């Protein structure tokens, strides 16, 4: 299903990469995308897949374009165009200067002071889950830990009842790696539908939860509207229910397959914060994009107004020009270069919450279940898209090797 080459796009720059189903997906998704950085591939290519779009394949260009919001607008960040056009989440669908007032408000509800405040709860949720799993000697890591640990933290943060988790998790899945049950726009509207009545309840009775704070915030010298609160809370939901969930699985799949890396963190726990950055580089998983606001020549390439450009956050840290032996995981790597949380004015607001969840997971899992591996006869399957992920991760261990601290 290829779209015909637009007239202004030179055919010598075509490389038909499919972001929702890469060729080498069997070898791992970061591997599958890494083909965009083979010797023969230009720094900037055009794929005719998914409606047709540009792809920057190197961190230098990826960074540059994320810095230049004049030319590369986040007004239409999702591929395909239909999704990107429907996309109106706040702050992501906004450029500076308009973006910054809304980003300050969102930073209030997931930024570092919130995270510090939630440290003991994060720790308790991890411990509770792991202690419950520990004697079993096995789990599906994605649905037994990777999903409920971040999601319960987020529901706590947002003041939303855990009974709603199955509903909301289903909706977020479909905006990110769509099956076909519902379009991006349909999944987005359903999430908006969930939120509106909750926002209205909390505007009148102002509280401490993320939704109350947003709903009662002030932007550009006026109260925020219900419609604006909704567009912002919907986005926070997506971040809290999907991306960290999928990153934890990549990291745990790797640790499960690499006893020596588990051992290094067990033996030298002080390296865990540095280890968290090197996993974030290696198992980077996001890829959205921008849309051209005007005709623009970018690195010798003529981009036209309305062109979409995929700027894969994933690829910058896998670029051998920024990190030697990029596919190798080295916890003592001297300068870990990545853009896993993005680059420019949309730099992930959740990054401090994410790092805490990752670091607490590494610490608590490895303290209690130091020895584990992939279940016998299992092959791990990755999924690709805006946010790539792990389909399933069956783990096993001898409960006699486990610890209660
Ligand atoms: C490993 C975990 C995570 C990764 C890799 C990640 C990745 C990213 C990336 C690449 C962006 C920028 C997208 C762009 O420039 O268009 C972003 C933005 C954002 N993230 Fe995350 N994320 C993670 C976790 C979280 C969490 C836990 C939250 C909590 C709510 C969150 C909330 C947000 C929000 C609100 C934005 C929009 C910022 C803006 O547009 O100004 N994220 N993330
Ligand atoms: C691309 C993102 C990671 C960023 C936060 C959630 C996400 C899917 C968005 O829609 C904006
Ligand atoms: C961010 N997700
Ligand atoms: K849009």
- The domain limits of the chain are 1-405
Ligand 1 within 6 A of CB of 235: yes
Residue 47, strand partner residues: 53
How crowded is residue 257: how many other Cβ atoms within 10 Å of its Cβ? 12
Closest ligand to Cα 245: 1
205 is written with which tokens?
Answer: 């009775």
Examine residue 80 and say whether the peptide bond preceding it is cis (omega within 30 degrees of 0). yes
User: In whole angstroms, what is the distance from residue 251 CA to residue 362 CA?
Assistant: 9
Tell me how far the alpha carbon of residue 304 lies from the centroid of ligand 1, in angstroms.
Answer: 28
Closest ligand to Cα 350: 1
Secondary structure of residue 57 in the 3-state scheme: coil
127 assigned ligand-binding residue: no
Ligand 2 within 6 A of CB of 386: yes
DSSP 8-state code for residue 383: E
How crowded is residue 68: how many other Cβ atoms within 10 Å of its Cβ? 15
Residue 377 C-alpha from the chain's centroid: 29
Å resolution of this model? 2.0
Residue 298, strand partner residues: 301
How crowded is residue 179: how many other Cβ atoms within 10 Å of its Cβ? 7
Q: Which residues contact 61 (CB under 8 A, 6 or more apart)?
A: 43, 44, 298, 299, 311
Write the burial class of residue 60 (CB in 10 Å: 0-12 exposed, 13-18 middle, 19+ buried).
middle
- Runs of H (alpha helix) within 177-305: 184-204, 210-215, 226-238, 244-257, 259-267, 272-282
Nearest atom in ligand 3 to the alpha carbon of residue 240 is: 2
User: In whole angstroms, what is the distance from residue 166 CA to residue 174 CA?
Assistant: 13
Assess contact for 274 and 332: CB atoms under 8 A.
yes
109 is written with which tokens?
Answer: 């509800």
Method: X-ray
User: In whole angstroms, what is the distance from residue 245 CA to residue 249 CA?
Assistant: 7
124 is written with which tokens?
Answer: 């308790």
383 half-sphere exposure, CB direction, 13 A CA radius: 20
Nearest protein CA to atom 1 of ligand 3, as residue: 239
User: In whole angstroms, what is the distance from residue 95 CA to residue 262 CA?
Assistant: 42
Assess contact for 318 and 59: CB atoms under 8 A.
no
User: In whole angstroms, what is the distance from residue 401 CA to residue 280 CA?
Assistant: 28
Nearest protein CA to atom 25 of ligand 1, as residue: 350
Ligand 1 within 6 A of CB of 311: no
Please give the CATH architecture assigned to the domain spanning 1-405: Orthogonal Bundle (1.10)
Length in residues, the chain: 405
Tell me how far the alpha carbon of residue 112 lies from the centroid of ligand 1, in angstroms.
Answer: 14
Tell me how far the alpha carbon of residue 90 lies from the centroid of ligand 2, in angstroms.
Answer: 10
Ligand 2 within 6 A of CB of 239: yes
Burial 272-288 (b: 16+ CB within 10 A, else e): beebbbbbbbbbbbbbb
Q: Which residues contact 194 (CB under 8 A, 6 or more apart)?
A: 164, 167, 168, 171
Write the burial class of residue 332 (CB in 10 Å: 0-12 exposed, 13-18 middle, 19+ buried).
exposed
Closest ligand to Cα 185: 4
Ligand 1 within 6 A of CB of 389: no
Tell me how far the alpha carbon of residue 169 lies from the centroid of ligand 3, in angstroms.
Answer: 14
User: In whole angstroms, what is the distance from residue 241 CA to residue 384 CA?
Assistant: 17
Ligand 2 within 6 A of CB of 78: no
Backbone φ and ψ for 31, nearest 5 degrees, come out as -65, -40
Ligand 1 within 6 A of CB of 84: no
Assess contact for 48 and 3: CB atoms under 8 A.
yes
Backbone φ and ψ for 301, nearest 5 degrees, come out as -105, 130
Ligand 2 within 6 A of CB of 288: yes
Tell me how far the alpha carbon of residue 238 lies from the centroid of ligand 3, in angstroms.
Answer: 7
User: In whole angstroms, what is the distance from residue 61 CA to residue 168 CA?
Assistant: 35
Secondary structure of residue 218 in the 3-state scheme: strand
Q: Choose among 284, 321, 297: nearest CA to 68.
A: 297
11 is written with which tokens?
Answer: 């055919």
Nearest-Å Rg of the Cα atoms of the chain is 21
Q: Choose among 219, 199, 220, 201: nearest CA to 210.
A: 199
Backbone φ and ψ for 91, nearest 5 degrees, come out as -90, -5
């Amino acid at each position: 299903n290829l779209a015909p080459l637009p007239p202004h796009v030179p055919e010598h720059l075509v490389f038909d990469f499919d972001m929702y189903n890469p060729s080498n997906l069997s070898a791992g998704v970061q591997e599958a995308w890494a083909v965009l950085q083979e010797s023969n591939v230009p720094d900037l290519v055009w794929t005719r897949c998914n409606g047709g779009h540009w792809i920057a394949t190197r961190g230098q260009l990826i960074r540059e374009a994320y810095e230049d919001y004049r030319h590369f607008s986040s007004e239409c960040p999702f591929i395909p165009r239909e999704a990107g056009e429907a996309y109106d989440f706040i702050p992501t669908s906004m450029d500076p200067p308009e973006q910054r007032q809304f980003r300050a408000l969102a930073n209030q509800v997931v930024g570092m002071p919130v995270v510090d405040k939630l440290e003991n709860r994060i720790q308790e949720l991890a411990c509770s889950l792991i202690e419950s799993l520990r004697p079993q000697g096995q789990c599906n890591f994605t649905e037994d830990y990777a999903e409920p640990f971040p999601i319960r933290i987020f529901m706590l943060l947002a003041g939303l009842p855990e009974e709603d988790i199955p509903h909301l998790k289903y909706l977020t899945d479909q905006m990110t790696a769509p099956d076909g049950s519902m379009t991006f726009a349909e999944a987005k509207e359903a999430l908006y539908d969930y939120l509106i009545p909750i926002i209205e309840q909390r505007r009148q009775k102002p509280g401490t939860d993320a939704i109350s704070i947003v709903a009662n915030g002030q932007v550009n010298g006026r109260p925020i509207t219900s419609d604006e609160a909704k567009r912002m809370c919907g986005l926070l939901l997506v971040g809290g229910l999907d991306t960290v969930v999928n990153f934890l699985s990549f990291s745990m799949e790797f640790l499960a397959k690499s006893p020596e890396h588990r051992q290094e963190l067990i033996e030298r726990p002080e390296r865990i914060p540095a280890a968290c950055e090197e996993l974030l580089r290696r198992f980077s998983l996001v890829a959205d994009g921008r849309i051209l606001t005007s005709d623009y020549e970018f690195h010798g390439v003529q981009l036209k107004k309305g062109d979409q450009i995929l700027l894969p956050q994933m690829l910058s840290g896998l670029d051998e020009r920024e990190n030697a032996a990029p596919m190798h995981v080295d916890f003592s790597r001297q300068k870990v270069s990545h853009t896993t949380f993005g680059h420019g004015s949309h730099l992930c607001l959740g990054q401090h919450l994410a790092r805490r969840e990752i670091i607490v997971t590494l610490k608590e899992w490895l303290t209690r279940i130091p020895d584990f591996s992939i279940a016998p006869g299992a092959q791990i399957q990755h999924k690709s898209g805006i946010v790539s992920g792990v389909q399933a991760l069956p783990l096993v261990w001898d409960p006699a090797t486990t610890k209660a601290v």
